[PDB]
Design a protein around this ligand. Structure first.
Ligand SMILES: COc1ccc(C2=N[C@@H](c3ccc(Cl)cc3)[C@@H](c3ccc(Cl)cc3)N2C(=O)N2CCNC(=O)C2)c(OC(C)C)c1
Length: 88
């Protein structure tokens, strides 16, 4: 009974670019796939892998910054919620 969400078009484009095949998700799925996006596109610092650089990327459009640490949970959840609607 986790909340279901419907990503808006930019977030959905990112999710589908890493092989998600649906239009509704749980938050934990959304997080999982954004993490995979970062990993597969190598947007992280090789030395401190918590650090992301996304200025040249649609991910930077979603989060509204050129760089962030994955420890920025307020920012990450807030920007994700701005990019979806709740279904069920
Ligand atoms: C020391 O290296 C780590 C430690 C933790 C994370 C991480 N941490 C997880 C996480 C981060 C923030 C929130 Cl709010 C929730 C979950 C999740 C995640 C989810 C969404 C985004 Cl936008 C980024 C990362 N997330 C991951 O996606 N991980 C888990 C670890 N390894 C991975 O290959 C993927 C991490 O993320 C990379 C993608 C940068 C790197």
């Amino acid at each position: 009974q986790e909340t279901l969400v419907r990503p808006k078009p930019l977030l959905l484009k990112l999710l589908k670019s890493v092989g998600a095949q649906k239009d509704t998700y749980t938050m934990k799925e959304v997080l999982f796939y954004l993490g995979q996006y970062i990993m597969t596109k190598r947007l992280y610092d090789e030395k401190q892998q918590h650090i992301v650089y996304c200025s040249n990327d649609l991910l930077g459009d979603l989060f509204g910054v050129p760089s962030f640490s994955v420890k920025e949970h307020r920012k990450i959840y807030t920007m994700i919620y701005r990019n979806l609607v709740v279904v069920n």
